[PDB]
Design a protein around this ligand. Structure first.
Ligand SMILES: NC(=O)c1ccc[n+]([C@@H]2O[C@H](COP(=O)([O-])OP(=O)(O)OC[C@H]3O[C@@H](n4cnc5c(N)ncnc54)[C@H](O)[C@@H]3O)[C@@H](O)[C@H]2O)c1
Ligand SMILES: NC(=O)c1ccc[n+]([C@@H]2O[C@H](COP(=O)([O-])OP(=O)(O)OC[C@H]3O[C@@H](n4cnc5c(N)ncnc54)[C@H](O)[C@@H]3O)[C@@H](O)[C@H]2O)c1
Ligand SMILES: NC(=O)c1ccc[n+]([C@@H]2O[C@H](COP(=O)([O-])OP(=O)(O)OC[C@H]3O[C@@H](n4cnc5c(N)ncnc54)[C@H](O)[C@@H]3O)[C@@H](O)[C@H]2O)c1
Ligand code: PRO
Ligand code: PRO
Ligand code: PRO
Ligand code: NA
Ligand code: NA
Ligand code: NA
Lengths: 516, 516, 516
């Protein structure tokens, strides 16, 4: 198979009339379908259930954006039988044929990208550019994994020769496993976690987050139209601690690919370590969890650049990103100038229904709102509230861009993942202390430094212990292929998505010798 | 760093009078040194204790080969401080500097190889060639990992460039981890599991098997002479279920590299999945556990070639190998002619003290002996005893080569790892049925087919589900670099030793972007 | 598939007492087996006929080395059905599977090499070293083509990518073809012409030379033991102008791979260009035909080195090589000193039955003998006879080493391939005239220059118009891999044996585009 060198899908800015018109048309088409019901997808067919999942517009939660079927234990069992039955022949597909299937799904997705972005707007309250970058990342994952998979094709392993013998080592896929996905990148991450394992010959049961069941269904419409054989990808919307826990714990689940909270990640990794009755393997579990990400700014930085970058990182998608800057660590000389600039910028951010393309839309659910508001109550005790900190008017879950200052490094709001538009500002003496404070959390996902001092940047390269570090730019929006993505410590297992290494996680190796 | 391309260390066969002379002298000197005491090795110094580990000669268990110090909790804590402290600066060595240190350790081990072989003969009851293969394999691990580590050096990761930015991804070592090793390859596997992680910048606390603590101290004598900095490598002989479990479960242990019984490996892997109080990472655990390894023979095979490889595979080191043929699966037309040839060869095998270079020495301990004899009694009620089945006269732990035939595929002796000189012969109709029976165990480590039929060989290549498969040759003795070693299913986590992939298991990845 | 890098099979010289012992035993056993009957081999089974081919010992033609079955039209038809049917599934084998089958065939031939050399000594009158070179060359073809075939595997072709599309180009084998081989290298060339096409997925009907049918059956014994599927390779000893022509002209024959006389090669190539009734393709035909090969010597040469290489080149296997020096072109200052040295060396050559390991055995048949003696009589009227020119006493076909001097460049004996121990010496003024005379024949196979002058060597490199040119060494004995073998002009189609290019001749290319 020969295709163009990988390039990232362009993220639509909507600066042109044509792009704005195209988005308006998609928003309209999407909302005209708010009444749709999407069944489960099992063994190549849409299969409905008696019970259902309801999906709301977090910008107007009296508005239903759609409903899906609801998978319980029996549907989980049916998905298993279908996935294992498919694995038997899907594993034997030439790699070029599997890679071509992915390339088809990418092209189908690329043709439906405005519709997908409009679904993200309405279903999870992403503004226009956030939605665009989510869909573009999903496309990138498919394009990138299609190509990367060929690097593993029969027989890919470099071995030492031996006289009188052929020694052949090669990779094979593991089997059927479960993908359990978050609501916050419910096209991109949902899509990458599924197609990476599938590309190399594994089969997948995908469990979308409750808050994003509708857009996950539309991803499966693309999978179905691309023509994945029956049982290869299966769609099981349902309750995480029910159907998800059942599959994680199952003796016939071979691997688990998880992105989500640390709380859940810890349970999953623990259950994966256990031999379920009748299980005949050591389960592989990949769990990519949260962060408490910091940006450091020292007195040498471009303060305007820093402030813009901080505001993008802290408040993009209302701070509901594992990559979000939730801590701003400022050296003595950077403290006032950067903080004043951050407050000026952030106080100008608009908040409202996502479809109007505000700076911030709503947080995703009533539960998210309750959790973010509780952390704001905690923070009022721990630091100084200087901006926002309030629910805004309307039914939608609108929360103001929030800033706490004089936050002690060990405060709960300086330690725990709030996952909303809440920035904790920490004042430190110098760069060494800034690094100490950055490293001193259980987490290690993203981090940023604004500085013109080469020695500070190169020092951070070696000692700011996060899996994704950025200098003099935002810390969010890791691009497939460019910035392998994944963290250290309690940010997860360092499965680097959008990287050649990712596929190896879903392969095992056989070594066959023939003595002639 | 530029060295000669890797070549495997030649395995001495003691055919030349020169080799015999060298080996006699080495055995004499080791025997003359019986009763010697070896302390722990922690933070670069030999540290003694009040309690001791006693190492007996399984050929004459009245004889004390030597004793070691004994690590409990306090020594585990001292070793942990020493390893983490060492790690801080060891991780920053250039890869070339670390690789040269491995190369120096290999040159030193090679200079001491007759003495280390002699030590294995006396301590674990290896005959001369089995001892020579073990030491040569340990040399090979060091030479191989020294070179393979350079493939991962700063910055090794292939990324997509982005306008206006440098994007640099690179590998870093994990931290301090524990290595827990078996008695059956106490030089090769003990060395490989240590120097792999250490090559790429990790530090290691090493826990040798109770039955092989003396040869483990001698490997540490080599490390100490080579000049590994204080803390990089630590030697903690002790009780597996005491000090070993303590480290496996410790919040400050970063990874666990384990080779041994499935029973223990299940416990380690389960414990590794738990977050111990105060732990700040997801533990990595590699467990390579046993097998129930079969050789298939069909009627097209060279029956003399088969009989010979079966005997070598079944009985080499007394069947005490994770790779040993413990099942012989014979199609109907192969049954009589192969079984006859196997019985004729096996009844001529000599059994006696290892220093005499017999075909078989003793099993390793009174507990191994008890267990093997017990399985023999079980086997007597499951299949037909046609050879051996007896303890031999003498104080050493000598068990005659044993064959059961007409064994049911689901018999305990056809399913459970006996780890002794006990072969179970299974009669099947055809190659298709041969393959079903071969695959139908909890394990997936090694396998073999003797056949001249290309379609049967190529069928097995695709469907004989073992990590290490061999055609028309023995199924033991996988060579570093040539045959990446590791299994499927409950034979472990498929960490492939002596392959480039192995070292990636002890690294994590950082992605650092600078926007200019 | 990973094997050791290619190395040429060492050519036995029988200097060691061990080699002499092995060769004496092998000759004794072949001699003891005289009169054995070998059937055809078709669709994987040995198939006898009523008629037979008789194979005589040219050293004692009263002795029947053996007999074979004889293929006419019906057997050609059965072989065609078998080859096309085999082709349907053989073309779909992974390249690695087909290459391993070649490797197994090479290991088997190597194990039988003394017996095959012994068979050549008796059947075609090779002395021991000539027989050893022939078998070693056949081993080399298999080893070489097994590896070279992997360079062409799915999808091998380098193409330009295109937006929105996968473009995949790859090679497929042609079909079933006929191989028609000479008697003079009945192991090497017979094997190479067969296993080349077969390696990459073609099937072959093989027609050995009448004088070498016994050693051809023995090569087929090797194929059959190796396990080539029924139909992939078929053995049809028979009359070239009967069954050979029948296949060349058949509408269902896809390609023809031919080595032999120019006269036959002209007919084959002419017939291949015709569309037989109902034929659905343009036939491919490779014809490698004879030479009139010269060595040039100038006055700068080492005259002893030259005399020695000339004698080896002219007289090795009785001058019965397409590569043999049949012309010695001497500049004026080289004329006397080289001719004297050549005459002195050649008059010491021993001639006798091949089993005695003489310098020269007999020519291959009564017809070869008639033809060579007839050319000798022609030569007597064209140049000056200065050595030999006689039949020797005895029943075997023994002809003395023969030299003619002052031969006109346009003499029949200086133009036409005699294929016997007959050297024509031509006297020229200078290196320029040496080159004109060298180029002025219908042929362009092998050539040689002895000279120390760099400008003459480098001039010849550019302008001595032969496919295989050699400086300061013999011009026979081209090694697989080292010296791609094949000529220019009426020495054939320049299908270069033992080179990567050879296999491309038996493949065609498909280009498949998917627009996503
Ligand atoms: N490391 C990363 O790449 C990264 C990226 C995106 C999001 N995240 C993290 O995801 C979280 C936000 O996503 P979320 O709120 O959907 O997280 P979540 O943990 O609550 O849920 C994630 C998924 O797991 C399911 N789940 C919940 N309980 C389960 C159980 N006990 N067993 C099996 N499945 C269960 C949910 O139904 C959902 O599908 C944040 O913590 C964020 O940091 C991390
Ligand atoms: N897969 C492989 O590469 C491979 C190779 C060699 C041996 N083995 C396996 O090794 C086994 C024989 O070796 P063994 O008898 O030493 O195995 P074992 O499991 O009894 O012990 C292995 C090591 O673990 C330690 N140990 C025992 N209990 C422990 C605990 N609960 N926690 C931590 N450590 C503990 C022991 O002290 C020893 O050092 C066989 O099953 C064999 O197949 C596997
Ligand atoms: N260029 C080379 O690589 C090379 C190598 C070795 C031999 N040769 C040539 O081989 C010749 C000697 O070999 P030979 O005497 O076996 O040659 P030949 O032409 O008489 O026969 C070669 C093969 O063709 C068959 N044959 C004869 N007539 C045929 C017909 N019309 N149609 C189909 N097949 C026919 C024969 O049975 C034999 O199998 C010499 O000229 C020599 O130079 C060339
Ligand atoms: O970096 C980001 O913001 C997104 C989410 C994880 C992968 N890429
Ligand atoms: O294959 C074998 O027999 C040994 C065991 C570990 C790897 N080498
Ligand atoms: O060069 C030679 O003498 C032989 C003839 C074919 C190729 N090898
Ligand atoms: Na929703
Ligand atoms: Na011992
Ligand atoms: Na003959």
């Amino acid at each position: 198979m020969t295709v163009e060198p990988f390039r990232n899908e362009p993220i639509e800015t909507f600066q042109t009339e044509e792009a704005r018109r195209a988005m308006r048309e998609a928003l309209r088409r999407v909302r005209e379908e708010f009444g749709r019901h999407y069944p489960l997808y099992i063994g190549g067919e849409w299969v409905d259930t008696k019970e259902r999942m309801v999906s709301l517009n977090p910008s107007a939660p009296s508005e239903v954006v759609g409903t899906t079927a609801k998978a319980g234990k029996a549907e989980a069992e049916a998905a298993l039988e279908a996935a294992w039955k498919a694995f038997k022949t899907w594993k034997d597909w030439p790699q070029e044929d599997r890679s071509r299937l992915l390339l088809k799904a990418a092209a189908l997705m690329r043709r439906r990208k405005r519709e997908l972005e409009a679904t993200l707007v309405y279903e999870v309250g992403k503004n226009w550019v956030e939605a665009s970058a989510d869909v573009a990342e999903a496309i990138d994952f498919i394009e990138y994994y299609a190509r990367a998979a060929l690097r593993y094709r029969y027989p890919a392993v470099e071995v030492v020769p031996y006289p009188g013998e052929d020694n052949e080592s090669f990779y094979v896929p593991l089997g059927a496993g479960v993908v359990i996905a978050p609501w916050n990148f419910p096209v991109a991450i949902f899509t990458g976690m599924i197609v990476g394992p599938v590309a190399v010959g594994n089969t997948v049961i995908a469990k979308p987050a409750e808050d994003a069941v509708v857009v996950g269904a539309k991803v499966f419409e693309i999978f179905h139209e691309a023509g994945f054989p029956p049982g290869v990808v299966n769609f099981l919307p349902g309750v995480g601690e029910e159907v998800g826990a059942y599959l994680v714990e199952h003796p016939r689940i071979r691997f688990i690919n998880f992105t989500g909270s640390l709380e859940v990640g810890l349970k999953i990794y623990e259950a994966a370590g256990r031999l379920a009755p009748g299980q005949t393997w050591f389960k592989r579990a990949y769990v990519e969890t949260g962060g408490k990400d910091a940006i450091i700014v020292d007195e040498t930085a471009d303060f305007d650049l820093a402030a813009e970058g901080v505001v993008v990182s802290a408040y993009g998608f209302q701070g509901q990103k594992c990559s979000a800057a939730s801590r701003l660590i400022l050296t003595q000389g950077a403290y006032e100038p950067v903080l004043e600039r951050v407050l000026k910028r952030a106080e100008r951010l608009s908040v409202g229904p996502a479809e109007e393309n505000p700076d911030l839309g709503p947080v995703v659910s009533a539960e998210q709102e309750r959790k973010v508001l509780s952390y704001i109550e905690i923070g009022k005790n721990e630091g100084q509230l200087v901006l926002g900190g309030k629910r805004l008017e309307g039914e939608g879950y609108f929360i103001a861009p929030t800033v706490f200052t004089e936050v002690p490094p060990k405060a709960r709001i300086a330690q725990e993942e709030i996952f909303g538009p809440v920035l904790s500002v920490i004042r430190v003496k110098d760069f060494a202390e800034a690094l100490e404070v950055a490293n001193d959390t259980p987490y290690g996902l993203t981090g940023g430094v604004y500085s013109r001092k080469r020695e500070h940047l190169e020092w951070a390269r070696r000692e700011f212990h996060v899996g994704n570090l950025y200098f003099n730019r935002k810390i969010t929006g890791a691009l497939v292929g460019v910035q392998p993505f994944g963290g250290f410590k309690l940010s997860g297992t360092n499965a680097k998505t959008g990287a050649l290494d990712y596929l190896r996680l879903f392969l095992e190796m056989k070594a066959v010798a023939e003595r002639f």
